[PDB]
Structures are given as structure tokens and as C-alpha cells.
Amino acid sequence: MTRWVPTKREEKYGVAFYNYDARGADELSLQIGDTVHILETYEGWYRGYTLRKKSKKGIFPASYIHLKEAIVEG
Numbered sequence: 001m002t003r004w005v006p007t008k009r010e011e012k013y014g015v016a017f018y019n020y021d022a023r024g025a026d027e028l029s030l031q032i033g034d035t036v037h038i039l040e041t042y043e044g045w046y047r048g049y050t051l052r053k054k055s056k057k058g059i060f061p062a063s064y065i066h067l068k069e070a071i072v073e074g
Contacts, residue, residue, distance in 0.1 A: 013037035028058020
């Protein structure tokens, strides 16, 4: 139908602070304190996967999304 944005000029991933509870494959359950890697975007509508759930993929509202400058273990 339409062409989505390939999310350019981005760092890598960010964090999602909300109480989202997806009830389908199209959506994705998001909780506060979890990190999400955005792969797609379209203004208030991005897609990706949580650092803990790489196998799973879904979309989430940017209303509560904040991109970070990557993290380091240790």
C-alpha cells in the first residue's frame, strides 16, 4: 500500500518506558526498563525488537520511545 521509512540518521537502539501489552503478532509487549532496537519508523510508529527478545519483532508508539547512545557491559 505505502512505503515506510528506513529510519536513517539513527544510532542503534533505545529504551521504552511504558506499560504496553500487545495481544497479537503485529504488536509487541513493552514494559518500563526494557530496551528496544528500532529497525523501522514512520513518525509515531516504529518497529523493532527488545534486546532480550531478538527473535520476536513488533511495533510501538514513539510517544514513549527514547533513543540512546548504545550501552556497554561491565
